[PDB]
Design a protein around this ligand. Structure first.
Ligand SMILES: CCCCCCCCCCCCCCCCCC(=O)OC[C@H](COP(=O)([O-])OCC(O)COP(=O)([O-])OC[C@@H](COC(=O)CCCCCCCCCCCCCCCCC)OC(=O)CCCCCCCCCCCCCCCCC)OC(=O)CCCCCCCCCCCCCCCCC
Ligand SMILES: CCCCCCCCCCCCCCCCCC(=O)OC[C@H](COP(=O)([O-])OCC(O)COP(=O)([O-])OC[C@@H](COC(=O)CCCCCCCCCCCCCCCCC)OC(=O)CCCCCCCCCCCCCCCCC)OC(=O)CCCCCCCCCCCCCCCCC
Ligand SMILES: CCCCCCCCCCCCCCCC(=O)OC[C@H](COP(=O)([O-])OCC[N+](C)(C)C)OC(=O)CCCCCCCCCCCCCCC
Ligand SMILES: CCCCCCCCCCCCCCCC(=O)OC[C@H](COP(=O)([O-])OCC[N+](C)(C)C)OC(=O)CCCCCCCCCCCCCCC
Ligand SMILES: CCCCCCCCCCCCCCCC(=O)OC[C@H](COP(=O)(O)OCCN)OC(=O)CCCCCCCCCCCCCCC
Ligand SMILES: CCCCCCCCCCCCCCCC(=O)OC[C@H](COP(=O)(O)OCCN)OC(=O)CCCCCCCCCCCCCCC
Ligand SMILES: CCCCCCCCCCCCCCCC(=O)OC[C@H](COP(=O)(O)OCCN)OC(=O)CCCCCCCCCCCCCCC
Ligand SMILES: CCCCCCCCCCCCCCCC(=O)OC[C@H](COP(=O)(O)OCCN)OC(=O)CCCCCCCCCCCCCCC
Ligand code: HEC
Ligand code: HEM
Ligand code: HEM
Lengths: 57, 62, 75, 247, 385, 93, 50
């Protein structure tokens, strides 16, 4: 259904740039969360939450 | 050699030439570049505006 | 009871094959320089030999040796 | 210049923050603040670090408020115009021990102790140079070194003759978490603390670097594809030349 | 006609960006000019957003830059963007000048374009110097002291010029405030000279790597070189992002985070790395007047280039000896910067002197001789007699 | 407007090149093409051709100046050592 | 004080008033505060500290 895919998303440039901005919003939120989670998980034990939990226990 | 004998583009022509398929492939890449350019432009403009917003030196004296 | 980990590493690498040669060079220089200091008129020589070069060779070996291993031991 | 005048080049220790996805060991920042407050703060100032920046890195909010209250600063003058002192808040800065440079030079044999706020970035070598300077005090200088009175020997200082005496000895600081405070352990902690005081944006900067590098690498590869796509019609041109008839 | 053609301003935008006929065969060395425009936009925007917070007194300069690094939200982004972007501005500008030197884009039609580019190079060197002095670290004070004590070598009015530049009797609060005011002012003069650079380029069009006429096969700049420039723009952003976020103080000297002290000499007074070749050309001559004359002649020796190139074809694309001596010149420039980074010691004095002689003998001695030899060899290789 | 001088570039239509007859261009649509065609062949073969033709001009002068710099650096490091102080004061005075 | 010289008083006439007032000096070798009899570069002082 590539004809339906083209006719929906890529025929009108308004719907095209609207899908670009909607994808950019979803991408910003999800990708920022993914980099934050990967960075904080790679550095486990070295962050202040882990030092604070060690002080708490 | 005539001008009506078009040369061999056969090494660069794709074997299937469906229109919607090739256009969806081209515009998905152009749209992905515009996607990440929109995210980067938003982050850049928010970086400069957030630099202009306030400082910690006065937010402590809030 | 936990003594200094870097000093333990520096002793361990002073008692090796290269380190005993380099401390032999530095101790030979130190003997020659204390003999030169025993001589009269030493304060008016204006060119006095110092063993900073042999100490720098020895300390550079010990630095290249104990650089990667120390921060494993340091908690 | 000579090797003694350059100084000994400090080796490359494996820090916990060397590497493009690494972060400061924040417990090491906490222990480094302990060794700063108990040893280094007698002669060295920290005039660029506010108390509020310590919150959420090495101590808690109520934990930094007690230290800020333990120091005292100049208040606005009272109703009669007299000078007035005040227990500090979070918004104040960490105070140095000496009121002026001439007091520091009176107390330290004429050599001014530098302010340690930027000294990891201010010296070539960085954390390696700070660690090697703090631990690399030989008990005896090498034979032949004309040493001035009041100047100790350190091969990592450029020139060899430093005016800081060796101040890190074993178990001089009782750590809070029971870390065995040797001289090298305390040196690792203050070097991490001084690197935090130099670059307190370090963790967030590497985070944003990962985001930026991923987005720009993806944009570079997409732009290469879009370039080849836009340029394919020109890139695969063919010219033929059947020479024209003479007139 | 189209609205991008009939409008007043969109016709300018159209004939310079959209419909501008570029040759088909130009390569990615022609992206350096668009990269310099991007660099200059980056520098101006980040510099304005840091001049909103910078305080140009001598007591507040270094501490205000330290306030930008510490209190301003994303202020380290702006500061490292400005410093590493100035370093990348000079990297891309050296590539732009070296492209003009290789492909012969200085020659007979584009001589005014070459001279306007040389004027832009002078102004960018001066802007980098003033903005470096604006930090007022240890390298800023002593670099300003050396390069403004240079002008006390002029025999009649030297001390007058020096005490007028300083605003006093040494580098002090007047000099730092002059240097911030002029470091703000000068990039708008650079932007005007960039517009004049674009005019002089527009009247005759770009050259191509072959050197032969590009008037036959030509391509509009929009949709072809817009994306061919977008590739290198994103590559430039990638390398600048690496150098801004992961290794942000590599290209800078580590002495600058010492507060500016006039009573303490930091034992190696060294400018930024993109001024080190001209600093070595300065230090190679053992005279104060002849040294600054030789440094200014090193910058202004680019104007002897369209008159000494005795070659009849344009560009070293098809010239073996011109290729070899161009790369001897490029790595001589690298060796000259590496000499200028070092101390004034025994092999380095003669090495910098021989390298300065090579730097001047390329424009005046090597290029006419080699190009005349190549003209004669190109004739006798295919003329049978 | 006023006319400018004689330039060597016109615009679309009157470029200033010679007259062309007989040269015939053929170009197929990129939407019918394969972008990223041949990038692996030209990544290892065409790139080696370009590097093989153009590396002596870049590698002989780089090697010359790097050997000169390395030799000067080693001579300086020998001079300001302890083994070469006699030669240091000789070539310095 | 130096702006009054050539307007309402002379040089040796302004110097006596500036010497009559006292300002802050650079601190001595022990880092103690120190007062200094004023000169032509100093400013006319106010009656109140704040
Ligand atoms: C590692 C170093 C490179 C090793 C050699 C491999 C590449 C190669 O064989 O090229 C031969 C080629 C010579 O062949 P040529 O046809 O005579 O020259 C082509 C023309 O220059 C015209 O050049 P072009 O249009 O072909 O491309 C311009 C060039 C260079 O493009 C640019 O000049 C853009 C400049 C950088 C933009 C970003 C600026 C950032 C500012 C800071 C810069 C810091 C540097 O980019 C490339 O060469 C891409 C080809 C990469 C092939 C890699 C394959 C490796 C084997 C597998 O030499 C180069 O192009 C070297 C340029 C890349 C150096 C990277 C360092
Ligand atoms: C530092 C890191 C960057 C290092 C860059 C060093 C080289 C500087 C290059 C200067 C800029 C440039 O000339 O690039 C244009 C060049 C293509 O431009 P062109 O005008 O066709 O080339 C003319 C040259 O003479 C080319 O001469 P040639 O045609 O003889 O050589 C062909 C070959 C030379 O061979 C090589 O380059 C070996 C590598 O170049 C290529 O065609 C490689 C094309 C690879 C493009 C792959 C497109 C991927 C799109 C899909 C990714 C989507 C991302 C995720 C999206 C997620 C969305 C949510 O692209 C590259 O050279 C790529 C360089 C390597 C990039 C990393 C490859 C990883 C692949 C994954
Ligand atoms: C700041 C950077 C923001 C970039 C945003 C890019 C974007 O919004 O989308 C890209 C569009 C695509 O434009 P296009 O590829 O010419 O598509 C034309 C319409 N079709 C053919 C599909 C019917 O491009 C445009 O519509 C023009 C906007 C580009 C600026
Ligand atoms: C080293 C291996 C790469 C170079 C060797 C080589 O030349 O391989 C050729 C193929 C692709 O060849 P191509 O030129 O992309 O194919 C275009 C279509 N043809 C020409 C067949 C009509 O190359 C391949 O298919 C190998 C793919 C390897 C992918 C590795 C990714 C890194
Ligand atoms: C007209 C002025 C031009 C200025 C151009 C400056 C950029 C040139 C390249 C400099 C390095 C990369 C940007 C670092 C700054 C930044 O903002 O990086 C941070 C962001 C993500 O960070 P964040 O969203 O988590 O938070 C940020 C605030 N808390 O990384 C990126 O996505 C960069 C993507 C680059 C895309 C550039 C697109 C150009 C649009 C121009 C408008
Ligand atoms: C003129 C716009 C002023 C925006 C403003 O009033 O900005 C206020 C906000 C403040 O929120 P913050 O995210 O800066 O940080 C909060 C503390 N960390 O700025 C922003 O970033 C959001 C707006 C970005 C600019 C949008 C431009 C496109 C529309
Ligand atoms: C959103 C606005 C939509 C308006 C409606 C519309 O887009 O109108 C479409 C018009 C139609 O023009 P025509 O030729 O068909 O006129 C026929 C009249 N009978 O095109 C335009 O406006 C002009 C389009 C040109 C675009 C120029 C892009 C400039 C890029 C650079 C930007 C500046 C950088 C400076 C450095
Ligand atoms: C000093 C001054 C130098 C002068 C020369 C400067 C040259 C420009 C250099 C900078 C590149 C700008 C790229 C603009 C792309 C464009 O505008 O894209 C316009 C094209 C027009 O599509 P089309 O008409 O082919 O439509 C065919 C069917 N109608 O839409 C696109 O595909 C957009 C695709 C996404 C592009 C995002 C680019 C974001 C760049 C961020 C960084 C910018 C800095
Ligand atoms: C008491 C007096 C002290 C104490 C307790 C510390 N320091 Fe050090 N320090 C001191 C002086 C007088 C000097 C000047 C030395 C000179 O220039 O001759 C210094 C110097 C430093 C330096 C600079 C080294 C250099 O310039 O290359 C550093 C990085 C330094 N001091 C650090 C430091 C740390 C981390 C301390 C305790 C945890 C510390 N000092 C204690 C005087 C004194
Ligand atoms: C031509 C483009 C420019 C160049 C090449 C340039 C170059 C520089 C350089 C090299 C520095 C020193 C960076 C450092 O080591 O910290 C600097 C600093 C500075 N520049 Fe610029 N600059 C440019 C444009 C501008 C403009 C237009 C402004 C003013 C609006 C500006 C404002 C500053 C400020 C405030 C500093 C202060 C120190 C800092 O925070 O970096 N710059 N500039
Ligand atoms: C702020 C700095 C500069 C900017 C923005 C700038 C901008 C440009 C641009 C956009 C081009 C067209 C694209 C290209 O050919 O690369 C160009 C061409 C050129 N520039 Fe620059 N330039 C700058 C500095 C210089 C310098 C320092 C020189 C050398 C003295 C120079 C000499 C040239 C030449 C000779 C050309 C024509 C090359 C050709 O097409 O054959 N420019 N410039």
């Amino acid at each position: 259904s590539f004809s339906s895919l083209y006719k929906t998303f890529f025929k009108r440039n308004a719907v095209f740039v609207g899908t670009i901005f909607a994808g950019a919003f979803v991408f910003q939120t999800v990708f920022d969360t993914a980099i934050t989670s990967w960075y904080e998980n790679h550095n486990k034990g070295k962050l202040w939450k882990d030092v604070k939990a060690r002080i708490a226990a | 050699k005539s001008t009506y004998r078009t040369p061999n583009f056969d090494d660069v022509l794709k074997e299937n030439n469906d229109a919607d398929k090739g256009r969806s492939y081209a515009y998905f890449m152009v749209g992905a570049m515009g996607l990440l350019s929109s995210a980067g432009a938003k982050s850049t403009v928010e970086t400069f505006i957030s630099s202009m917003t306030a400082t910690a030196d006065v937010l402590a004296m809030a | 009871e936990v003594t200094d980990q870097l000093e333990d590493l520096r002793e361990h690498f002073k008692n090796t094959e290269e380190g005993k040669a380099l401390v032999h060079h530095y101790e030979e220089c130190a003997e020659r320089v204390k003999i030169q200091q025993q001589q009269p008129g030493y304060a008016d020589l204006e060119h006095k030999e110092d063993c900073v070069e042999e100490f720098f060779h020895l300390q550079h070996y010990l630095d290249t040796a104990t650089a990667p291993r120390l921060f494993d031991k340091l908690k | 210049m000579t090797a003694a005048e350059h100084g000994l080049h400090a080796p490359a220790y494996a820090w916990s923050h060397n590497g493009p996805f690494e972060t400061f060991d924040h417990a090491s920042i906490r222990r480094g603040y302990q060794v700063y407050r108990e040893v280094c703060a007698a002669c060295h100032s920290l005039d660029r670090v506010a108390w509020r920046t310590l919150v959420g890195v090495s101590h808690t909010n109520e934990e930094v408020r007690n230290m800020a209250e333990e120091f005292e600063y100049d208040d606005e003058p009272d109703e009669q115009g007299n000078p007035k002192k005040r227990p500090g808040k979070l918004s104040d800065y960490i105070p140095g021990p000496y009121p002026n440079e001439q007091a520091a030079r009176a107390a330290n044999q004429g050599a001014l102790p530098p302010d340690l706020s930027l000294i990891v970035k201010a010296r070539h070598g960085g954390c390696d140079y700070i660690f090697s300077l703090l631990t690399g005090y030989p008990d005896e200088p090498p034979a032949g070194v004309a040493l001035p009175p009041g100047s100790n020997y350190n091969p990592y200082f450029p020139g060899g003759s430093i005016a800081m005496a060796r101040v890190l000895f074993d178990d001089m600081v009782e750590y809070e978490d029971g870390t065995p405070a040797t001289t090298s352990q305390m040196a690792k902690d203050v070097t991490t603390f001084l690197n935090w005081c130099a670059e307190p944006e370090h963790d967030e900067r590497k985070r944003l670097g990962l985001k930026t590098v991923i987005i720009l690498s993806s944009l570079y590869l997409l732009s290469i594809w879009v370039k080849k796509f836009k340029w394919a019609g020109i890139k695969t041109r063919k010219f033929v030349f059947n020479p024209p008839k003479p007139r | 006609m189209a609205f991008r053609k009939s409008n007043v301003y969109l016709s300018l935008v159209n004939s310079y960006i959209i419909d501008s006929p570029q040759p088909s065969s130009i390569n990615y060395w022609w992206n350096m000019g668009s990269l310099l425009g991007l660099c200059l936009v980056i520098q101006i925007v980040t510099g304005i957003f840091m001049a909103m917070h910078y305080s140009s007194n001598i007591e507040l300069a270094f501490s205000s830059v330290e306030h930008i690094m510490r209190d301003v939200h994303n202020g380290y982004i702006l500061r490292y963007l400005h410093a590493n972007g100035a370093s990348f501005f000079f990297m891309v500008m050296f590539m732009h000048m070296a492209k003009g030197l290789y492909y012969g884009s200085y020659r007979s039609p584009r001589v005014t374009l070459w001279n306007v580019g040389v004027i832009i190079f002078i102004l960018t060197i001066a802007t980098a110097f003033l903005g470096y002095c604006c930090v007022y670290g240890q390298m800023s004070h002593w670099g300003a002291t050396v390069i403004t004590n240079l002008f006390s070598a002029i025999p009649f009015v030297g001390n007058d010029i020096v005490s007028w530049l300083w605003g006093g009797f040494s580098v002090s609060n007047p000099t730092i405030q002059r240097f911030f005011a002029l470091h703000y002012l000068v990039p708008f003069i650079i932007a005007a000279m960039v517009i004049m650079h674009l005019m002089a380029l527009h009247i005759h069009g770009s050259s191509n790597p072959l050197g032969i006429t590009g008037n036959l096969d030509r391509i509009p700049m929009h949709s072809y070189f817009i994306f061919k420039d977008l590739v290198t723009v994103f590559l430039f952003m990638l390398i600048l992002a690496l150098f801004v976020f992961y290794s942000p103080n590599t290209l800078g000297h580590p002495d600058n985070y010492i507060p500016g002290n006039p009573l303490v000499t930091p034992a190696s007074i060294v400018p930024e790395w993109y001024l080190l070749p001209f600093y070595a050309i300065l230090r190679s001559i053992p005279d104060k007047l002849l040294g600054v004359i030789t440094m200014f002649a090193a910058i202004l020796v680019l104007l002897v280039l369209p008159f000494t190139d005795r070659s009849v074809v344009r560009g070293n694309t098809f010239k073996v000896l011109s290729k070899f001596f161009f790369f001897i010149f490029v790595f001589n420039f690298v060796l000259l910067g590496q000499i200028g980074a070092c101390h004034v010691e025994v092999p380095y004095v003669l090495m910098g002197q021989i390298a300065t002689f090579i730097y001047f003998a390329y424009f005046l001695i090597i290029v006419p001789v080699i190009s005349t030899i190549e003209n004669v060899l190109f004739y006798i290789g295919r003329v049978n007699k | 407007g006023p006319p400018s001088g004689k330039t060597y570039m016109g615009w679309w239509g009157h470029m200033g090149g010679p007259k062309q007859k007989g040269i015939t261009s053929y170009a197929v649509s990129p939407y019918a093409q394969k972008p990223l065609q041949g990038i692996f062949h030209n990544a290892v073969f065409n790139s080696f051709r370009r590097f093989k033709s153009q590396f002596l001009y870049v590698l002989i002068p780089a090697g010359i100046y790097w050997y000169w710099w390395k030799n000067g650096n080693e001579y300086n490091e020998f001079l300001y050592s302890k083994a070469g102080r006699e030669e240091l004061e000789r070539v310095n005075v």
